[PDB]
Amino acid sequence: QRLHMLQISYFRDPYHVWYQGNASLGGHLTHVLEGPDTNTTIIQLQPLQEPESWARTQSGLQSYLLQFHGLVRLVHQERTLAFPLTIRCFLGCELPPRAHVFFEVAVNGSSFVSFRPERALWQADTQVSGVVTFTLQQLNAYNRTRYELREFLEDTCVQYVQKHI
Ligand SMILES: *[C@@H]1O[C@H](CO)[C@@H](O)[C@H](O)[C@H]1NC(C)=O
Ligand SMILES: *[C@@H]1O[C@H](CO)[C@@H](O)[C@H](O)[C@H]1NC(C)=O
């Protein structure tokens, strides 16, 4: 009983990103993400959700991506980022027979930061940089990247597993 979500973001520069990703419910592929930031495709492969719910979910994913891209631009604006770069986000929730939730971020294929939900705080996952410290400062500064995210993992994700498995 798990929802896993995987997003790879290909940045050619701060202002143009290509997304590719998918989600799996149980061990079954259920969603696909693809395309540039200015017109991203998001598909449920199986008709799991009704339109009013899918629209809210689709809108919610699109809103996340805007925040995600906005944060990458801010980090570039404030520290110098080396392009091209790829970012991988791996996240989701698992229901035991209380849910366990996670969100792990990698840059160019190496561990970068992850979310610790008991305090809704992000931590470094590498032992090596000004980029890492500024990103964590930004992620830990705003309600949207701590408490709203924790709720998405602990409430929205968990209700999706209960309703659709
Ligand atoms: C999901 O995307 C990853 C990353 O590109 C890919 O390696 C994997 O084969 C995809 N899996 C599914 C089930 O779509
Ligand atoms: C990521 O890898 C590309 C490919 O070599 C490189 O040009 C770029 O500088 C790297 N960026 C980071 C942030 O490691």
Numbering used by the authors: 9 to 105, 109 to 139, 141 to 177
Paper lines:
The presence of a lipid bound to EPCR is key for its biological functions.
For this, we performed a wide crystallization screen and obtained EPCR crystals in varied conditions, which ultimately led to solution of the structure in three different space groups. Crystals grown in other conditions yielded EPCR structures in two novel space groups, C2221 and P212121, containing 2 and 4 molecules of EPCR per asymmetric unit, respectively. Structural alignment against EPCR in space group P3121 yielded root mean square deviations of 0.459 and 0.400 for EPCR molecules in space groups C2221 and P212121. We observed, however, non-homogeneous signals inside the lipid cavities. Fitting of a diacyl phospholipid scaffold (lacking the outermost head group) satisfied the overall shape of the map, albeit with some degree of uncertainty for the orientation of the carbonyl groups. The only molecule found in P3121 yield a ~ 1375 Å3 cavity while the two molecules in the asymmetric unit of C2221 have pockets of 1410 and 1540 Å3.
